Design an enzyme around this catalytic site. Structure first.
Site, PDB file in Angstrom:
ATOM      1  N   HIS A 182       6.286   6.686  10.667  1.00 42.69           N
ATOM      2  CA  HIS A 182       5.009   6.555   9.416  1.00 42.69           C
ATOM      3  C   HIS A 182       3.813   7.286   9.020  1.00 42.69           C
ATOM      4  O   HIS A 182       3.090   7.139   9.274  1.00 42.69           O
ATOM      5  CB  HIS A 182       4.692   4.715   9.426  1.00 42.69           C
ATOM      6  CG  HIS A 182       4.054   4.123   8.437  1.00 42.69           C
ATOM      7  ND1 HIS A 182       4.283   4.703   6.761  1.00 42.69           N
ATOM      8  CD2 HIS A 182       3.187   3.450   8.306  1.00 42.69           C
ATOM      9  CE1 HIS A 182       3.993   3.803   6.547  1.00 42.69           C
ATOM     10  NE2 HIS A 182       3.453   3.171   6.842  1.00 42.69           N
ATOM     11  N   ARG A 231       0.255  -1.565   0.151  1.00 46.84           N
ATOM     12  CA  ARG A 231      -0.070   0.341   0.147  1.00 46.84           C
ATOM     13  C   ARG A 231       0.511   1.346  -0.055  1.00 46.84           C
ATOM     14  O   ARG A 231       0.517   2.113  -0.605  1.00 46.84           O
ATOM     15  CB  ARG A 231      -0.742  -0.391   1.346  1.00 46.84           C
ATOM     16  CG  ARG A 231      -1.921  -0.923   1.509  1.00 46.84           C
ATOM     17  CD  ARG A 231      -1.906  -1.188   2.869  1.00 46.84           C
ATOM     18  NE  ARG A 231      -2.540  -1.973   2.541  1.00 46.84           N
ATOM     19  CZ  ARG A 231      -2.221  -4.029   2.721  1.00 46.84           C
ATOM     20  NH1 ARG A 231      -0.718  -4.311   2.566  1.00 46.84           N
ATOM     21  NH2 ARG A 231      -3.363  -4.749   2.806  1.00 46.84           N
ATOM     22  N   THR A 232       1.948   1.517   0.938  1.00 47.80           N
ATOM     23  CA  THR A 232       2.695   2.861   1.074  1.00 47.80           C
ATOM     24  C   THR A 232       3.207   2.722  -0.475  1.00 47.80           C
ATOM     25  O   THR A 232       2.611   3.591  -1.277  1.00 47.80           O
ATOM     26  CB  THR A 232       3.575   2.369   1.996  1.00 47.80           C
ATOM     27  OG1 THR A 232       2.511   2.279   3.181  1.00 47.80           O
ATOM     28  CG2 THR A 232       4.368   3.960   2.186  1.00 47.80           C
ATOM     29  N   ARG A 282      11.589   4.151   2.492  1.00 50.95           N
ATOM     30  CA  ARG A 282      11.275   2.473   3.818  1.00 50.95           C
ATOM     31  C   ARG A 282      11.956   2.960   3.874  1.00 50.95           C
ATOM     32  O   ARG A 282      12.958   1.790   2.565  1.00 50.95           O
ATOM     33  CB  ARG A 282      10.083   2.153   3.010  1.00 50.95           C
ATOM     34  CG  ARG A 282       9.864   1.156   4.165  1.00 50.95           C
ATOM     35  CD  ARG A 282       8.808   0.525   4.033  1.00 50.95           C
ATOM     36  NE  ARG A 282       7.573   1.085   4.392  1.00 50.95           N
ATOM     37  CZ  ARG A 282       6.352   0.461   4.318  1.00 50.95           C
ATOM     38  NH1 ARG A 282       6.164  -1.165   4.460  1.00 50.95           N
ATOM     39  NH2 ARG A 282       4.879   0.924   4.479  1.00 50.95           N
ATOM     40  N   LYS A 324      27.126  -3.607  -4.067  1.00 47.05           N
ATOM     41  CA  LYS A 324      28.118  -3.339  -4.346  1.00 47.05           C
ATOM     42  C   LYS A 324      29.001  -2.718  -3.816  1.00 47.05           C
ATOM     43  O   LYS A 324      29.967  -1.435  -3.636  1.00 47.05           O
ATOM     44  CB  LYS A 324      28.425  -1.753  -5.370  1.00 47.05           C
ATOM     45  CG  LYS A 324      28.310  -2.576  -6.676  1.00 47.05           C
ATOM     46  CD  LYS A 324      28.307  -1.784  -7.987  1.00 47.05           C
ATOM     47  CE  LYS A 324      28.174  -2.239  -9.359  1.00 47.05           C
ATOM     48  NZ  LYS A 324      28.049  -1.487 -10.591  1.00 47.05           N
TER      49      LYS A 324
HETATM   50  O1  LIG Z   1       3.770  -3.383   8.111  1.00 50.50           O
HETATM   51  C1  LIG Z   1       2.914  -3.342   9.179  1.00 50.50           C
HETATM   52  O2  LIG Z   1       2.094  -3.591  10.448  1.00 50.50           O
HETATM   53  C2  LIG Z   1       2.178  -1.728   9.628  1.00 50.50           C
HETATM   54  C3  LIG Z   1       2.226  -0.788   8.380  1.00 50.50           C
HETATM   55  N1  LIG Z   1       2.308  -1.305   7.366  1.00 50.50           N
HETATM   56  C4  LIG Z   1       1.511  -0.355   5.788  1.00 50.50           C
HETATM   57  O3  LIG Z   1       2.892   0.722   5.923  1.00 50.50           O
HETATM   58  C5  LIG Z   1       1.620  -0.680   4.307  1.00 50.50           C
HETATM   59  P1  LIG Z   1       2.207  -1.839   3.497  1.00 50.50           P
HETATM   60  O4  LIG Z   1       3.791  -2.517   4.226  1.00 50.50           O
HETATM   61  O5  LIG Z   1       2.099  -2.660   2.573  1.00 50.50           O
HETATM   62  O6  LIG Z   1       3.039  -0.621   2.463  1.00 50.50           O
HETATM   63  C6  LIG Z   1       4.397  -1.246   8.508  1.00 50.50           C
HETATM   64  O7  LIG Z   1       4.651  -0.271   9.536  1.00 50.50           O
HETATM   65  O8  LIG Z   1       4.541  -0.859   6.943  1.00 50.50           O
END
Ligand SMILES: O=C(O)C[C@H](NC(=O)CP(=O)(O)O)C(=O)O
Ligand SMILES: O=C(O)C[C@H](NC(=O)CP(=O)(O)O)C(=O)O
Ligand SMILES: O=C(O)C[C@H](NC(=O)CP(=O)(O)O)C(=O)O
Ligand SMILES: [Zn+2]
Ligand SMILES: [Zn+2]
Lengths: 310, 153, 310, 153, 310
Positions: E134, E54-55, E105, E84
């Site tokens: 987040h 989703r993110t 991320r 590398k």
């Molecule tokens: O992973 C979770 O349980 C909550 C949270 N989930 C999300 O952000 C959604 P996703 O990882 O699919 O983008 C995270 O901290 O990554």
């Protein structure tokens, strides 16, 4: 025929007080009156399906000290059960057509009892089956307590460590509950506590036991402090919190201890006993291991000799 | 008895007094001799001069006298040191560090495959003057290294 | 009490010229006057924490040729040190309460010396500790040179191969520097050269040694050419350039060699000695291995027998 | 004008003089803030008595000048301590480490999964008067730790 | 030049009620009237070094829904950083010389912070860093919360789950403590409890909060039940005891549930929210997810565009 002749040694719970006594008494005899050919012409299978230094080499050493020949495997990997899919039942079935006794150590609880249903006249000796029993350890521990305490009654014994997966303590508690007046202090992480099946027996016998969250609370009372290693190999992953020794014994905590007290341990120790304890007249774990020689000789004699005279 | 030669000098009744510590070495001995532990009016002088010799470091620990080995162990770290036993604002004994036959515990064998690392044992090498540099031989692996290398513990 | 009685055999550097001589002399005796029960009733632990074909089986064979019993492990994987985290110190501590001598081979330099601090009266015999020593190899090599050269002095000896990680050559050079008049030619990749600690001793003794970049340069001079295997298992990755034999011995290069010269090798050989050398009256590596039987019997006799008379 | 009770020489031209460091600090301050990594005349007097300040500790660094920035950074170990600015023998200034709002390049973030441990950046922490103790917050991971647990260099 | 223009969005602790209200109103205007070219010609790096469905995807649809272009990765295994040995610092150094913004991320805490010290003028949006923050999750949770309660002030909020490693709860809890009258309920195993720094910020702010051992113990007084996944991949081995959900929301638990209470969850869920809940009226997680498009288009619009969208 001595009481032990051709008997399978699977569980201390199947052994009686006078049985254990005949072993200790015989042990004592061999330890001063060596019988070099007591077992000339026998061939014992030393089958260990799980790791061992003490148990296997002490056993094999005893066999040799008595004139037996030994044949066997220290790893199940290169057996037909290892690479060909053979059951444990069939493995024991064929091996018992070759030899006179079988000393076996296995990873699953009950592997030894099952061996008996499949071996005929061949006595099976349990060198350890999972977290269930280890009677030979207990015979050498009883011999070690006897010879240092001059008694097996009214002792105050603390058991520290992994009491749950510790087949060592399961078998020793059932033995020491067979004598009189012994008192038990159990010190263990809640996760790895003493099973209920053993406690209930204690109650049922009216044995005095109790729990403590530190060695400090009992140091001044015990005559024997049985330290145990955390059974990392058996822990379920949820118990992974409990891998590091919660209770560690350093030379300083032996300060208020009775002069006659001895620190025992089945070994291998990892970190539950700091190495500075080794130099205190209290550490008795290496003398306790050498004792494996004399107690297991005794057992092979009693089990393979209809009538022993020494 | 008297008052020292150079300026900013510190005094004491009984205690040890190490002088001639080469530059930048004083603080280190203060570490690996666990001197700083003892609450005995310690005095230290980093970067003091040293006449024609340059600059010096020096430590003074009252009521404290060095171990039956520390001077020998002080021989490798600072050969040209002088150890003055001062009793009642006076030197009732002066010594020079001698390099011992062998050195124990303090050193770590540079051979990574040596069993001394893994097992619960005390390191111990055998000192032997070589050509200018001293050679240390591990009791365990039998290798001999230059102290240049060994002194990376 | 013979000089060798109850002595630990850890490093040729701790052994003297007359010590080595008593072994060779005894070896010679056993090799013609077999003593079948010289060791009846003893139990020796053959503990190898690293791979071996020759060393372990020759040792075990010698023990049996002399009436000893053997108990032990050919792999550390199924020991308690292997799966339970036990130190090597504690392993040696308990094992020494079972047996009479311990033949041990280990991967880390100094594993044997450390065993002694932990074994009491039990003599430890170094079957190899890393790239440091291997005195038993040297005893069987000295026996092989003696019996083919009729001498251990004034010999011209070339050492070819991995001289750096070769515990075989480290121990043999220190032995052969104890006799007189021997001259040494060292042929090895620069990366895997003879350590300085051994060269310095040579100088300090005033022994004549020298370096050469080929067997061709020395073939006509040496009485013994000791070929060695590149210690692939020990090489640091930066030394990976040096894995293939830089110096290979084919049957044709033995053409200008002295008639009395013998090609020795500790073995296993990989490619440093082409197999056509095997059929030349010069190849002596398989006769040299059988010699392992006679030299190691001698050692077990001398170490476990207060007074030997043959 | 130090004090009196049996003599020894001990006064300097210019520099700094951290006075009133409690026990087992002085060593720590020399190590952490690297106040020994210089050619300057340093005089560390340990345990030397000072009334209420029974077993105080003292350090004097010639030529060396602290900064409001630096000085404050001592409140994390020896807060009560007083910095005396001595210039041309005249004590010209006198601070007392108060609390800094951010500690840089000295500590090490106890959070092992902190980016600071891998990347080539400088550690950095925000200081806060929690309740009993001082609370240290990593600039990067945002976790706060007892000023006591956060380790250093 | 709106308050957030060219600003870095790294942690909810650097933003204020005003900043947040700025984002949600924009979210709202954007939802009602899309701006397909509002980011025409911008090129944005989507750099995910940890997983995401989703993110990343809602982020990228958002850039596209606004006309922007996208370059990036979803795994650093094939990046120079991954094969590398490059530093993240150099990575962001070179990347910030191509694009207009970096959405990233990362598996380590403070990695988004770090990148800001090397991205020069390019703003860095934190799509999650280890278990720290987040913030864009927080934005859509707020938007969804206001969408379903009418406000963000004076709400009864229960957070169930891994509160220790949930980077989502860290942000969200901080975001709601910026509003007045919100009441907090926290239900988590004791090993995965809300970190101290958050409980402190709460106390200082006079926010009321209490622990609970059952969802049911708050089911009646809550407007928003925020469910979380046990951040399995972050647990230490010694925490492997809490890897399986302890609190599972099943439909029948929404019986005494307030009529306006919604169940939210940042997803993905495993066993903590049974599928029957899915079809009750309280389940709002899939709408919550879908609202990610708007909180995200709005943020981009604000950071990269100077004037309040007209
Ligand atoms: O992973 C979770 O349980 C909550 C949270 N989930 C999300 O952000 C959604 P996703 O990882 O699919 O983008 C995270 O901290 O990554
Ligand atoms: O494993 C333990 O620590 C206790 C006990 N130890 C032994 O029997 C000693 P060993 O494994 O070497 O033969 C066992 O049950 O295996
Ligand atoms: O490994 C070598 O080639 C030399 C030497 N070889 C031997 O001892 C023969 P083996 O390994 O079979 O017992 C050794 O040091 O192991
Ligand atoms: Zn070494
Ligand atoms: Zn951090």
């Amino acid at each position: 025929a001595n009481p032990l002749y051709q008997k399978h040694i699977i569980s201390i719970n199947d052994l009686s007080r006078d049985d254990l006594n005949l072993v200790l008494a015989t042990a004592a005899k061999l330890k001063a009156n060596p019988q070099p050919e007591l077992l000339k012409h026998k061939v014992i299978a030393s089958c260990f399906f799980e790791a061992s230094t003490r148990t296997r080499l002490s056993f094999e050493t005893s066999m040799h000290r008595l004139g037996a020949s030994v044949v066997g495997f220290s790893d199940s990997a290169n057996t037909s059960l290892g690479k060909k899919g053979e059951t444990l039942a069939d493995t024991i079935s064929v091996i018992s057509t070759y030899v006179d006794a079988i000393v076996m150590r296995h990873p699953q609880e009950g592997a030894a009892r099952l061996a008996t249903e499949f071996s005929g006249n061949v006595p099976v000796l349990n060198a350890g089956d999972g977290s269930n029993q280890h009677p030979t350890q207990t015979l050498l521990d009883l011999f070690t307590i006897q010879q240092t305490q001059g008694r097996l009654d009214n002792l105050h014994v603390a058991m520290v460590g992994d009491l749950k997966y510790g087949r060592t303590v399961h078998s020793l508690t059932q033995a020491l509950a067979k004598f009189d007046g012994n008192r038990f202090y159990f010190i263990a992480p809640d996760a790895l506590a003493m099973p209920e099946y053993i406690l209930d027996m204690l109650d049922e016998k009216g044995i005095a036991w109790s729990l403590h969250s530190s060695i400090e609370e009992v140091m001044a009372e015990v005559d024997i402090l049985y330290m145990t290693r955390v059974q990392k190999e058996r822990l379920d992953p949820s118990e992974y919190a409990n891998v590091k020794a919660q209770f560690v014994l350093r030379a300083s905590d032996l300060h208020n201890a009775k002069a006659n007290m001895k620190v025992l341990h089945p070994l291998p120790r990892v970190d539950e006993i700091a190495t500075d304890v080794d130099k205190t007249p209290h550490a008795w774990y290496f003398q306790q291991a050498g004792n494996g020689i004399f107690a297991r000789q005794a057992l092979l004699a009693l089990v393979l000799n209809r009538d022993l005279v020494l | 008895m008297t008052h020292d030669n150079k300026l900013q000098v510190e005094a004491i009744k009984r205690g040890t007094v190490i002088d001639h510590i080469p530059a930048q070495i004083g603080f280190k001995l203060l570490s690996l001799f666990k001197l700083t532990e003892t609450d005995q009016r310690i005095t230290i002088g980093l970067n003091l001069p040293s006449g024609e010799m340059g600059r010096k470091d020096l430590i003074k620990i009252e009521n404290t006298f060095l171990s039956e080995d520390q001077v020998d162990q002080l021989a490798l770290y600072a050969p040209q040191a002088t150890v003055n036993r001062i009793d009642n604002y006076e030197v009732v004994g002066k010594s020079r560090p001698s390099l011992p036959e062998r050195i124990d515990n303090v050193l770590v064998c540079p051979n990574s495959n040596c069993i001394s690392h893994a097992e619960p044992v005390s390191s111990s090498f055998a000192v032997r003057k070589r050509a200018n540099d001293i050679a240390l031989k591990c009791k365990y692996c039998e290798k001999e290294f230059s102290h240049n290398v060994v002194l990376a513990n």
